[PDB]
Amino acid sequence: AMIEIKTLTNNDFNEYKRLVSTVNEEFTQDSHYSQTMTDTLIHDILNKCIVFGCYENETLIATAALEQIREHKSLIKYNFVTNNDKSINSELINFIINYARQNNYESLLTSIVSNNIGAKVFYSALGFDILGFEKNAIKIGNTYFDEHWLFYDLIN
Structure with a gap:
């Protein structure tokens, strides 16, 4: 596929x-x-x-x-991908890693609902590491989910 970001x-x-x-x-x-x-x-x-x-x-x-929480932290959010296509999304998240490195960000964090192993493996393959596990980390409608938090080290 031929994509412009x-x-x-x-x-x-x-x-x-x-x-x-x-x-x-x-x-x-x-x-x-x-x-x-x-x-x-x-x-x-x-x-x-x-x-x-x-x-x-x-x-x-x-x-x-890419949302900066204001010291600052940067979070990847609102990631919607047609067909959950991982080729497309890998191009997108690899771009975000470079954008962040170029704009002198210190780290990139992402949160993943806890049984979404597809998304966790996808992010691990791009070099994100596990930070931790938060109970009731997000509320979707009236339904709470636990999440894994992962980070990418932009310093090194």
């Missing part, structure tokens, strides 16, 4: 919202329970949070956001 802005709202509502499942969350992307939320991330989109020709096929 673009920075998304407010002007991509329509397309972003179409992708995330159509994909529905976030790559690190559950196949049935994934957090919903409200209009306010979408606006807020597109308007420190940088959002990336993978395009094939005219079509937005995948996205992830």
Whole structure:
């Protein structure tokens, strides 16, 4: 597949919202329970949070956001990928690792629902290591999930 990775802005709202509502499942969350992307939320991330989109020709096929928590930490969030395609997502997360290294970030963290071994193996293969395990780390609708936290060492 032939993809361009673009920075998304407010002007991509329509397309972003179409992708995330159509994909529905976030790559690190559950196949049935994934957090919903409200209009306010979408606006807020597109308007420190940088959002990336993978395009094939005219079509937005995948996205992830790098959110800086303000000292600072950076988290990968809102990763929706058509068909959970790991070739596409590996190109996207490898890009995020380089973007972060270039902008002098210290680390990248990601959270994965605890029985999502597909996503954990995918991230391990990209060089992320286990940080830990948090109980009730995320609430999706009215349903809590435990999560693994992983990190990528950008210092070394």
